[PDB]
Amino acid sequence: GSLGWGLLFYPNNWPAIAAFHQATEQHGQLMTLADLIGFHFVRTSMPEYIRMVERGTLRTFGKDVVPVAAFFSGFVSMMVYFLWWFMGRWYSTTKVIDTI
């Protein structure tokens, strides 16, 4: 269940996200429409450095960025699912106690 949940995340988002990953050239630089939208519509407290998005590494091999991320989320969601299932149970408690 949680593995599919993971894997399907990017695919079910792509349709909404692809428009903005069309390329544009601003002042000699390549930008996505998405960068440019953020850039144009000025946020007081949102410096580009603060993002926390992929910026590349010497260990990416591919071409593989989204698939590894999707599987990684899949596998990690299994653990969280377990934990939160059981917490769903704990929160469903009908225990009556006797003092405060």
Binding site: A18, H21, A23, T24, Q26, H40, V42, T44, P47, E48
Partner: protein, 388 residues
Amino acid sequence: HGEKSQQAFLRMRTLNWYDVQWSKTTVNVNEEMVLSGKVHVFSAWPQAVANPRVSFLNAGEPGPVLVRTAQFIGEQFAPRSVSLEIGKDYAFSINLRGRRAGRWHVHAQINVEGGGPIIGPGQWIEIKGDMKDFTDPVTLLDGSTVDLEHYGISRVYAWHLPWMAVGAAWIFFWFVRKGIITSYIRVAEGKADDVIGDDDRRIGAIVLALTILATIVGYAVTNSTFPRTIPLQAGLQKPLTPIETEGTVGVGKENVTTELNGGVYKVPGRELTINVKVKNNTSQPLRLGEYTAAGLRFLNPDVFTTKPDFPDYLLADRGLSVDATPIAPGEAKEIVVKIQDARWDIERLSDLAYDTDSQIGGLLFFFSPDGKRYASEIGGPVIPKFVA
């Protein structure tokens, strides 16, 4: 607008703003303007603020009332973060396009990764028109134009609202075909299987097959529209190029150098008195015309007889005085400089008594007989005078 609340000493000892200029102070929806200026990275950078090795140029402005169209600093187009070297000066400019009718106060702004927002001078900019009329546009690589004000937004709703509806349908379906109360009771009694047996499982298996299908379809389609896409472009830009004209702190053969040597400010008050060891260093006689602190300008009216175009809240005509005795060339002279103005109190620079490092910072601007301006960095401990 927050700047008043920020700590006085941090404000003075970080970025030193000068020559800030607004191309226009009135604009129509869709009409361009440029905020430009220069900044000096103070040499004794405070611990409390990370090194400005990673920073971002920005228009200090209440949401997108003006759309930023491009910006530049250190002679680079700067949509992404940039390094500022301690001690250097950089010139920047920001192209703003009018979007929302009103009277907005628009600042030069830099944010340092370690430390947060540093607010430059800001000026009122009136905008005329109707936001309805606002467009961009923007040219893609394939050649076509789009209007970013609206581009893509239909496709988003087209995908989002169906799925929300489908999700609701699914909830309502089970809510109706079984009760909440009924199902509770059933399950609590024992069955349980009265609530769910295939072919409830058949309905599930079908909805799921339809869902995956719609998802494969929607993907492959949006893949045909838009068959060439790029990842978000991110990362620190190559090192900037500082201002070299002309000058311009610690640049060129000729310069002034100041050393703070004792200072007193009144608490409460309007006053700051500083002794400055000047040396010059140029081949010209120099009078001190200006002291800039946090965007604030304190002017010697002996030099500024007129008397520049610059935001009222921030323009003082008591940055006085020398004796008008033009110092050098080659002369070294300790001069008393008395800063007095309401704006020192108004911009809360008097609340340096509250700060955890009682210490001044900024640029001194010296002037020759003719135009020529020679800038030096001033900074160091000051002492408060506790008055009635």
